[PDB]
Amino acid sequence: VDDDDKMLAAEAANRDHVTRCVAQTGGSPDLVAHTAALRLYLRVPHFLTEWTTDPDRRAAVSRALALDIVSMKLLDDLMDDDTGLDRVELACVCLRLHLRALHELESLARDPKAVTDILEQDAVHLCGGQIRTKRSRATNLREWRAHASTYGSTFLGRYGALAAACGGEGQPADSVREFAEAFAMTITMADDLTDYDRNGERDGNLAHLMRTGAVAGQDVVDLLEELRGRALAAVAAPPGAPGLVPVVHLYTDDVLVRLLPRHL
Amino acid sequence: DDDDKMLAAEAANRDHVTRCVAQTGGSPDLVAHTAALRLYLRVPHFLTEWTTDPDRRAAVSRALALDIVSMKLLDDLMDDDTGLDRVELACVCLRLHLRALHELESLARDPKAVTDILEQDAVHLCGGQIRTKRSRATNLREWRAHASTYGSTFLGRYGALAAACGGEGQPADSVREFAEAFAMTITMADDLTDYDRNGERDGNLAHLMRTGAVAGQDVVDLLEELRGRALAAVAAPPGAPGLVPVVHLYTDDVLVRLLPRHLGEAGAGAMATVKFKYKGEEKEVDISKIKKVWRVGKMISFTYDEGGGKTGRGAVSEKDAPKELLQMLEKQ
Ligand SMILES: CC(C)=CCC/C(C)=C/COP(=O)(O)OP(=O)(O)O
Numbered sequence: 293v294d295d296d297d298k299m300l301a302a303e304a305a306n307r308d309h310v311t312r313c314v315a316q317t318g319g320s321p322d323l324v325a326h327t328a329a330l331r332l333y334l335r336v337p338h339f340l341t342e343w344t345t346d347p348d349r350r351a352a353v354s355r356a357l358a359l360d361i362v363s364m365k366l367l368d369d370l371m372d373d374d375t376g377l378d379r380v381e382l383a384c385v386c387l388r389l390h391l392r393a394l395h396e397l398e399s400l401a402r403d404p405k406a407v408t409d410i411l412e413q414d415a416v417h418l419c420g421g422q423i424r425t426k427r428s429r430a431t432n433l434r435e436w437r438a439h440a441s442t443y444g445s446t447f448l449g450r451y452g453a454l455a456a457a458c459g460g461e462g463q464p465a466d467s468v469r470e471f472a473e474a475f476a477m478t479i480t481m482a483d484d485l486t487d488y489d490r491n492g493e494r495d496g497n498l499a500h501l502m503r504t505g506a507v508a509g510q511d512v513v514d515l516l517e518e519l520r521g522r523a524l525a526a527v528a529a530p531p532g533a534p535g536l537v538p539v540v541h542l543y544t545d546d547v548l549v550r551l552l553p554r555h556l
Numbered sequence: 557d558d559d560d561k562m563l564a565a566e567a568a569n570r571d572h573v574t575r576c577v578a579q580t581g582g583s584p585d586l587v588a589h590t591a592a593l594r595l596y597l598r599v600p601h602f603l604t605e606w607t608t609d610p611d612r613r614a615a616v617s618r619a620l621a622l623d624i625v626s627m628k629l630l631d632d633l634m635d636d637d638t639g640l641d642r643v644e645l646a647c648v649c650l651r652l653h654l655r656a657l658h659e660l661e662s663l664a665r666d667p668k669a670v671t672d673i674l675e676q677d678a679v680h681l682c683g684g685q686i687r688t689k690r691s692r693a694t695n696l697r698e699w700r701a702h703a704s705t706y707g708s709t710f711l712g713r714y715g716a717l718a719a720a721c722g723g724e725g726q727p728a729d730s731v732r733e734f735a736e737a738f739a740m741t742i743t744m745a746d747d748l749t750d751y752d753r754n755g756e757r758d759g760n761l762a763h764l765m766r767t768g769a770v771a772g773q774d775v776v777d778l779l780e781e782l783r784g785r786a787l788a789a790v791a792a793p794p795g796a797p798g799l800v801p802v803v804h805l806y807t808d809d810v811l812v813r814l815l816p817r818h819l820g821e822a823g824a825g826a827m828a829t830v831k832f833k834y835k836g837e838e839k840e841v842d843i844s845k846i847k848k849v850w851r852v853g854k855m856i857s858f859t860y861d862e863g864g865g866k867t868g869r870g871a872v873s874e875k876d877a878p879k880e881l882l883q884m885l886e887k888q
Pocket residue numbers: 364365367368372418419422443444447480483646647650
């Protein structure tokens with residue numbers, strides 16, 4: 293029973309916790325499926341909870357983060373209005389998952405107030421940020437990383453901070469967050485480079501900029517190595533989360549080896 | 557002077573919500589939209605009426621505004637007909653809601669009380685709104701069952717939160733009972749306004765009324781039941797007598813201004829009658845047939861139409877005279 297076995301059951305456990313919740317509140321089969329297709333969103337919680345020693349607390353915190361991440365994901369499909377899904381169901385399942393998560397995270401936290409504290413602290417940064425991103429599209433790598441630092445980095449960093457606040461002792465809150473923010477930027481690029489052909493995306497899309505020459509391949513490569521670096525350092529701060537080392541390499545090499553050549 | 561309080565609390569809630577929408581990146585459209593949510597911004601004052609400390613009362617009041625407004629934005633996002641920008645709505649919605657959780661939690665009697673309340677009936681609320689839009693109402697009963705969720709359960713939660721967040725002397729149960737009753741009253745009013753203001757028809761109460769599928773007198777009864785439920789709640793000790801005029805104002809507004817727009821010619825149903833014994837007989841007459849009516853002591857004398865040119869006569873005691881007749885009296 294290695295680490296990959298833990299990741300997979302963590303992922304199955306989160307998905308089921310989420311689909312059960314979507315269904316119990318009125319979600320149509322289309323919506324239930326759509327949520328179970330959110331693979332990485334259901335898996336990331338497991339990485340954020342890697343510093344949590346007690347396995348029972350870890351599974352609980354893991355699925356509570358999953359409910360809220362899926363929730364924000366649905367609110368997003370709601371603002372893009374392109375999934376063909378029912379807007380009432382989307383809006384409602386979204387509110388429900390979110391409320392259940394709050395309730396689950398608060399009952400796991402050392403101090404209940406810290407959940408709202410984390411969620412409020414950079415709510416303007418995340419929300420004004422998401423707005424600016426869709427308002428004015430990026431045209432160079434600088435503006436891209438700037439935008440991505442909010443809907444990707446800040447977005448996962450909050451779940452990192454929550455993971456630490458609800459994971460008991462032996463949690464270097466600052467590092468978990470550093471890890472999350474760097475890991476997120478990496479995933480955002482991947483997503484961007486996948487979605488160019490899977491979603492038909494262009495405006496502000498990193499792949500589009502690369503293909504148009506507005507962004508140089510080696511810069512993208514640098515950013516990727518920097519992120520890898522920031523992530524390795526974060527999972528090395530005491531107590532440490534050596535489990536995440538191979539994970540950081542997996543997602544980074546995948547963008548370098550599989551995704552990038554597609555655009556260069 | 558209590559009206560001077562409702563106005564100032566509404567203005568303060570409005571200020572707090574607009575500044576917040578503005579700082580998060582909301583366009584002036586959206587800012588204008590949230591500032592327009594008048595009753596939404598004003599209801600908080602009603603919910604916090606049992607809060608003795610003014611400073612605390614203002615803080616809970618504006619925190620509730622933040623979340624009610626946020627929920628209304630989400631609702632606009634699910635209808636997608638405000639013309640407002642889908643992204644600003646979603647993000648401003650989330651920002652406000654988050655702000656609200658934080659402010660409410662800071663005033664709560666207990667750490668988990670806010671989230672307990674929000675979770676308790678999350679499913680009833682959410683799944684209820686889903687079913688409301690999924691199966692339009694076809695009779696009053698169905699209408700009331702749907703309104704019980706996005707209406708009564710919706711405001712009831714903020715009622716519970718005001719009690720949880722407003723220090724001592726809060727009859728939790730009564731605050732929530734007032735909110736749920738008052739919510740439905742306001743929901744009916746909205747439905748009968750929005751039939752013409754938004755062009756609404758499917759599952760809409762005015763429509764069901766105009767359609768014959770829902771009877772006027774029933775709507776009047778439900779309205780009366782709601783008024784009584786609300787009055788009782790604000791009567792529980794320590795009491796919130798200040799809400800009495802409020803309860804009457806909204807209930808009476810639906811009965812007097814809104815209802816006639818969808819019934820027409822006396823939608824109560826019981827076309828009034830005058831019973832009397834004329835020429836050794838038994839007679840009853842629809843107030844609609846009564847022509848002239850005058851008073852002689854405590855007797856009410858009158859004439860009416862029997863058929864064709866035919867003109868009938870009658871006189872009753874004023875204590876056997878239906879309200880309507882005694883009205884033609886004064887009005888003649
Ligand atoms: C403030 C809010 C609600 C933000 C949306 C949450 C989010 C960024 C989800 C993941 O992004 P994504 O890369 O899968 O989606 P997108 O195509 O919109 O960038």
